[PDB]
Design an enzyme around this catalytic site. Structure first.
Site, PDB file in Angstrom:
ATOM      1  N   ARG A   1       0.810  -1.204   0.000  1.00 43.68           N
ATOM      2  CA  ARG A   1       0.000   0.000   0.000  1.00 43.68           C
ATOM      3  C   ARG A   1       0.854   1.269   0.000  1.00 43.68           C
ATOM      4  O   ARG A   1       0.530   2.239  -0.719  1.00 43.68           O
ATOM      5  CB  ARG A   1      -0.959  -0.030   1.184  1.00 43.68           C
ATOM      6  CG  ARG A   1      -1.756   1.239   1.319  1.00 43.68           C
ATOM      7  CD  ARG A   1      -2.767   1.167   2.437  1.00 43.68           C
ATOM      8  NE  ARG A   1      -2.124   0.937   3.741  1.00 43.68           N
ATOM      9  CZ  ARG A   1      -1.637   1.884   4.535  1.00 43.68           C
ATOM     10  NH1 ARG A   1      -1.726   3.172   4.220  1.00 43.68           N
ATOM     11  NH2 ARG A   1      -1.073   1.543   5.659  1.00 43.68           N
TER      12      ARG A   1
ATOM     13  N   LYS B   1      19.971   0.820   7.108  1.00 42.15           N
ATOM     14  CA  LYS B   1      20.450   2.029   7.816  1.00 42.15           C
ATOM     15  C   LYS B   1      20.513   1.761   9.312  1.00 42.15           C
ATOM     16  O   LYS B   1      21.409   2.246   9.989  1.00 42.15           O
ATOM     17  CB  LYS B   1      19.556   3.244   7.475  1.00 42.15           C
ATOM     18  CG  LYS B   1      19.925   3.904   6.113  1.00 42.15           C
ATOM     19  CD  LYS B   1      19.068   5.142   5.701  1.00 42.15           C
ATOM     20  CE  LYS B   1      19.591   5.766   4.334  1.00 42.15           C
ATOM     21  NZ  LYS B   1      18.916   7.098   3.925  1.00 42.15           N
TER      22      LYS B   1
ATOM     23  N   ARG C   1       7.604  14.145  -0.571  1.00 39.27           N
ATOM     24  CA  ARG C   1       8.010  14.766   0.679  1.00 39.27           C
ATOM     25  C   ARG C   1       7.188  15.993   0.922  1.00 39.27           C
ATOM     26  O   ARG C   1       6.939  16.786  -0.001  1.00 39.27           O
ATOM     27  CB  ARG C   1       9.491  15.115   0.689  1.00 39.27           C
ATOM     28  CG  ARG C   1      10.325  13.910   0.841  1.00 39.27           C
ATOM     29  CD  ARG C   1      11.765  14.331   1.050  1.00 39.27           C
ATOM     30  NE  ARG C   1      12.569  13.159   1.241  1.00 39.27           N
ATOM     31  CZ  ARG C   1      13.372  12.904   2.271  1.00 39.27           C
ATOM     32  NH1 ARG C   1      13.505  13.747   3.221  1.00 39.27           N
ATOM     33  NH2 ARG C   1      14.082  11.761   2.261  1.00 39.27           N
TER      34      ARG C   1
ATOM     35  N   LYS D   1       1.986  11.924   6.369  1.00 39.79           N
ATOM     36  CA  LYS D   1       3.220  11.173   6.388  1.00 39.79           C
ATOM     37  C   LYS D   1       4.335  12.021   5.747  1.00 39.79           C
ATOM     38  O   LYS D   1       4.141  12.538   4.648  1.00 39.79           O
ATOM     39  CB  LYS D   1       3.072   9.818   5.685  1.00 39.79           C
ATOM     40  CG  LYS D   1       4.302   8.941   5.799  1.00 39.79           C
ATOM     41  CD  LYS D   1       4.092   7.544   5.174  1.00 39.79           C
ATOM     42  CE  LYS D   1       5.223   6.562   5.494  1.00 39.79           C
ATOM     43  NZ  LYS D   1       6.204   6.339   4.405  1.00 39.79           N
TER      44      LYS D   1
ATOM     45  N   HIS E   1       9.776  -3.226   4.396  1.00 39.06           N
ATOM     46  CA  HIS E   1      10.101  -1.816   4.610  1.00 39.06           C
ATOM     47  C   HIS E   1      10.904  -1.286   3.455  1.00 39.06           C
ATOM     48  O   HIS E   1      11.671  -2.049   2.845  1.00 39.06           O
ATOM     49  CB  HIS E   1      10.980  -1.569   5.834  1.00 39.06           C
ATOM     50  CG  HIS E   1      10.431  -2.053   7.125  1.00 39.06           C
ATOM     51  ND1 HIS E   1       9.304  -1.517   7.723  1.00 39.06           N
ATOM     52  CD2 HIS E   1      10.908  -2.991   7.979  1.00 39.06           C
ATOM     53  CE1 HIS E   1       9.085  -2.151   8.868  1.00 39.06           C
ATOM     54  NE2 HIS E   1      10.046  -3.046   9.046  1.00 39.06           N
ATOM     55  N   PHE E   2      10.745  -0.010   3.127  1.00 39.87           N
ATOM     56  CA  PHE E   2      11.506   0.673   2.121  1.00 39.87           C
ATOM     57  C   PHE E   2      12.595   1.419   2.860  1.00 39.87           C
ATOM     58  O   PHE E   2      12.295   2.342   3.655  1.00 39.87           O
ATOM     59  CB  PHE E   2      10.624   1.617   1.259  1.00 39.87           C
ATOM     60  CG  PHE E   2      11.338   2.169   0.058  1.00 39.87           C
ATOM     61  CD1 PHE E   2      12.139   3.297   0.165  1.00 39.87           C
ATOM     62  CD2 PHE E   2      11.248   1.526  -1.195  1.00 39.87           C
ATOM     63  CE1 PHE E   2      12.834   3.789  -0.939  1.00 39.87           C
ATOM     64  CE2 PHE E   2      11.949   2.014  -2.256  1.00 39.87           C
ATOM     65  CZ  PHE E   2      12.725   3.135  -2.133  1.00 39.87           C
ATOM     66  N   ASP E   3      13.852   1.001   2.673  1.00 41.05           N
ATOM     67  CA  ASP E   3      14.959   1.642   3.429  1.00 41.05           C
ATOM     68  C   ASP E   3      15.513   2.924   2.781  1.00 41.05           C
ATOM     69  O   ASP E   3      15.738   3.939   3.445  1.00 41.05           O
ATOM     70  CB  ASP E   3      16.073   0.615   3.674  1.00 41.05           C
ATOM     71  CG  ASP E   3      16.997   1.010   4.812  1.00 41.05           C
ATOM     72  OD1 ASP E   3      16.462   1.273   5.907  1.00 41.05           O
ATOM     73  OD2 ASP E   3      18.258   1.033   4.642  1.00 41.05           O
TER      74      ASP E   3
ATOM     75  N   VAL F   1       7.495  11.611   4.529  1.00 39.90           N
ATOM     76  CA  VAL F   1       8.283  11.164   3.399  1.00 39.90           C
ATOM     77  C   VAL F   1       7.796   9.794   2.968  1.00 39.90           C
ATOM     78  O   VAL F   1       7.511   8.959   3.815  1.00 39.90           O
ATOM     79  CB  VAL F   1       9.768  11.062   3.763  1.00 39.90           C
ATOM     80  CG1 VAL F   1      10.594  10.461   2.681  1.00 39.90           C
ATOM     81  CG2 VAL F   1      10.293  12.423   4.222  1.00 39.90           C
ATOM     82  N   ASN F   2       7.647   9.562   1.678  1.00 36.57           N
ATOM     83  CA  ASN F   2       7.204   8.260   1.175  1.00 36.57           C
ATOM     84  C   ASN F   2       7.605   8.046  -0.258  1.00 36.57           C
ATOM     85  O   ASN F   2       7.337   8.897  -1.090  1.00 36.57           O
ATOM     86  CB  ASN F   2       5.690   8.123   1.296  1.00 36.57           C
ATOM     87  CG  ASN F   2       5.233   6.705   1.071  1.00 36.57           C
ATOM     88  OD1 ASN F   2       5.475   5.830   1.941  1.00 36.57           O
ATOM     89  ND2 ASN F   2       4.584   6.450  -0.055  1.00 36.57           N
ATOM     90  N   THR F   3       8.169   6.886  -0.578  1.00 33.34           N
ATOM     91  CA  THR F   3       8.590   6.552  -1.934  1.00 33.34           C
ATOM     92  C   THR F   3       7.667   5.543  -2.579  1.00 33.34           C
ATOM     93  O   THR F   3       7.307   4.538  -1.942  1.00 33.34           O
ATOM     94  CB  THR F   3      10.015   5.997  -1.953  1.00 33.34           C
ATOM     95  OG1 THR F   3      10.920   6.960  -1.402  1.00 33.34           O
ATOM     96  CG2 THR F   3      10.477   5.667  -3.331  1.00 33.34           C
TER      97      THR F   3
ATOM     98  N   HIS G   1       4.121   1.626  -0.887  1.00 32.99           N
ATOM     99  CA  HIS G   1       5.276   1.783  -1.741  1.00 32.99           C
ATOM    100  C   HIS G   1       5.148   1.259  -3.149  1.00 32.99           C
ATOM    101  O   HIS G   1       6.076   1.475  -3.946  1.00 32.99           O
ATOM    102  CB  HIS G   1       6.516   1.138  -1.109  1.00 32.99           C
ATOM    103  CG  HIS G   1       6.881   1.756   0.190  1.00 32.99           C
ATOM    104  ND1 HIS G   1       7.193   3.096   0.315  1.00 32.99           N
ATOM    105  CD2 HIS G   1       6.902   1.252   1.450  1.00 32.99           C
ATOM    106  CE1 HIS G   1       7.450   3.367   1.580  1.00 32.99           C
ATOM    107  NE2 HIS G   1       7.262   2.258   2.295  1.00 32.99           N
TER     108      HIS G   1
HETATM  109 CL   LIG Z   1       9.847   5.876   2.024  1.00 32.77          CL
END
Ligand SMILES: [Cl-]
Ligand SMILES: [Cl-]
Ligand SMILES: [Cl-]
Ligand SMILES: [Cl-]
Length: 124
Positions: free
Chosen positions: A10, A66, A85, A41, A119-121, A43-45, A12
């Site tokens: 959902r 990270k 962003r 939110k 997770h998106f790192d 920041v999201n890619t 990414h």
């Molecule tokens: Cl992200």
């Protein structure tokens, strides 16, 4: 409760477009993926590749996350992505986002059976 794999999808995945269309992409997508419900939110890619290609990353290059955990994988190829962003004019409600399209390697943390992204790192 949403599963970790489902939450990753959902937040990414956006396989329906090759690339961000316009500067309003992020405002639209952040709202529709329910990432602005109680808070914006920050920041999201989103990744513009098939779900299968993104899942495949979990068998590609193992790299540190990270946070120092060792369940992160870096895509061998670049992928089309959009980073979203919040801008300075953003204040809940009326979230506002900058849309930045790029072609970059992705780094995801993977877990489970099936071993899939949770997770998106980062992107590189
Ligand atoms: Cl992200
Ligand atoms: Cl769900
Ligand atoms: Cl699931
Ligand atoms: Cl697809």
């Amino acid at each position: 409760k949403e599963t970790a794999a489902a939450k990753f999808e959902r937040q990414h995945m956006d396989s329906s477009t090759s690339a961000a269309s316009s500067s309003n992409y992020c405002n639209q997508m952040m709202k529709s993926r329910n990432l602005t419900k109680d808070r914006c939110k920050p920041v999201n890619t989103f990744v513009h590749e098939s779900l299968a290609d993104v899942q495949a990353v979990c068998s590609q290059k193992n790299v540190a996350c990270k946070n120092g955990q060792t369940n992160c994988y870096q895509s061998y190829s670049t992928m089309s992505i959009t980073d979203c962003r919040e801008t300075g004019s953003s204040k809940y409600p009326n979230c506002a986002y900058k849309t930045t399209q790029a072609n970059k390697h992705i780094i995801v943390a993977c877990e489970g059976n099936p071993y899939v992204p949770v997770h998106f790192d980062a992107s590189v």
